[PDB]
Amino acid sequence: IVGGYTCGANTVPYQVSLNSGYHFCGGSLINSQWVVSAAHCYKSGIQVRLGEDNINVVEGNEQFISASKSIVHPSYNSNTLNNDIMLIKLKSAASLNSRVASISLPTSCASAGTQCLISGWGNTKSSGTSYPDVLKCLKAPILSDSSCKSAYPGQITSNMFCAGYLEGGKDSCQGDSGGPVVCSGKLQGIVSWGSGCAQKNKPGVYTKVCNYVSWIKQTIASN
Numbered sequence: 001i002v003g004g005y006t007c008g009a010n011t012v013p014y015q016v017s018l019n020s021g022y023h024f025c026g027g028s029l030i031n032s033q034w035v036v037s038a039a040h041c042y043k044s045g046i047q048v049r050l051g052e053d054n055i056n057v058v059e060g061n062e063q064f065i066s067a068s069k070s071i072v073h074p075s076y077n078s079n080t081l082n083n084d085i086m087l088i089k090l091k092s093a094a095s096l097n098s099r100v101a102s103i104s105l106p107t108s109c110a111s112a113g114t115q116c117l118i119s120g121w122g123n124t125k126s127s128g129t130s131y132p133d134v135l136k137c138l139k140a141p142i143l144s145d146s147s148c149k150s151a152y153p154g155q156i157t158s159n160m161f162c163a164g165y166l167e168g169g170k171d172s173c174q175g176d177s178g179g180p181v182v183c184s185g186k187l188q189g190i191v192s193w194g195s196g197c198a199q200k201n202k203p204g205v206y207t208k209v210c211n212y213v214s215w216i217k218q219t220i221a222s223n
């Protein structure tokens, strides 16, 4: 996250770190057994880390649970990042508490102008590289589809939305991928892509979670 703020330990209790020997992606806990992340974060041997603040220090509220199963959206296109969404099942249920908690799926899509909360452990510089150890947060508005499509001509599908700041300076970035965009207490977005981070006229592009609820519910009901 570029140009954000320190969330505060476990103030984002649905935030998870995907770990494959190292943090590589975020995710969102949607119930005690299932995490939503980005399909582009797919890899084998995922360990899900819940209750994280400092990802480099065991602080005492973590739960580390291996993934049993990863399910990439059947129409995920790695070239266009259309349908950049995947589900990860935990080998054992998380214990939900004040520090580890699920985020609601949306019943309806969020409106342009809505301010959302984006979070993760990704790069904090638009040019440099500097990874934080503690969870960073950003408040960012959903942009109109017209401004989104104008920012990324020929590249925005109906399964994507833009959020952020056209002036630049504030954005999600590498290592935030898969993480949550929460608006009005519902998971509306997944950190997906963007051209660099926090660049002028290049806002973040997010998977549009409300298009996937039916798939998520059906998948969870069968796996």
Ligand SMILES: [Ca+2]
Pocket (backbone or CB within 6 Å): 052, 053, 054, 055, 056, 057, 058, 059, 060, 062
């Ligand atoms: Ca920790």
